[PDB]
Amino acid sequence: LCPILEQMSRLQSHSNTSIRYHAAVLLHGLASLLGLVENGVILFVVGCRMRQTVVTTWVLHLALSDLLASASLPFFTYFLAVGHSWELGTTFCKLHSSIFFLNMFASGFLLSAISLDRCLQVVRPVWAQNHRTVAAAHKVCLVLWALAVLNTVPYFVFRDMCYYNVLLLNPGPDRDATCNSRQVALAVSKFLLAFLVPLAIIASSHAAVSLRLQHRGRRRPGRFVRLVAAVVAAFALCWGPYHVFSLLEARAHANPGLRPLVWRGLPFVTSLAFFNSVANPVLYVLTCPDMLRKLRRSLRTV
């Protein structure tokens, strides 16, 4: 058992009294419900009310990923209700980590692909219109989902509290050094694959679009820069803190002085990330006139 697990085993956090403490983190139920409702509505509409295109396909995949991510939030709510104790066995935490990492990687890859598609349409309009099709979009989405599922095997193996256990499969001679190395490797990998590379691709695509509007002479109305800044700020405030605290914990493996902060900060940030499932749909659905009118009309008719 690595030092982190041995210290968590004797954690002195949650207590007993008549009054209620935990609600700050439990409040995520409203966000979960809103995300579920929005994702379901947009998916049903774009599937059975609008024609099948590339942008519609990306919106459908993003809504499906957000819905699959939000559908597991009630389980975490119940887990917190029990008092930060898992009632089920491995069949629970295994699936919870698998689905969580799968949705994270899927959202990241979908955002990166949407940014690349926008960059290509703004820079290569002829080639895009000649080659960008719905079949190619679906194939790219399937490939990205396959890569995401592949990136979930390590955590599916290493999970086992429902938390991480890296010394589960073939523990090395030095438990401490091997555990530290594996934790740092996994943290850096997930950071590079979920936050750094996707955000960098998004920023590069936006910068290329801005430069290709400034050179051609096209103005840039406030409705481009505003949406870009909103998407960037949402992605940041949603994902950054999670990986920041993960790296802080990986470094605290050797530095115990930082272990308490993680124990107090990790439950919060990990929940805040789920608010992304409520931010991405709007910025990617209600920002289009056609989809916005479709949704509004459909809601009014219902």
Partner: peptide, 16 residues
């Protein structure tokens, strides 16, 4: 035609 396709794609994806 290249300018227009650009503006149409920009207005369709939600930017413009």
């Amino acid at each position: 035609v290249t300018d227009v396709i650009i503006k149409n794609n920009l207005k369709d994806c939600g930017l413009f």
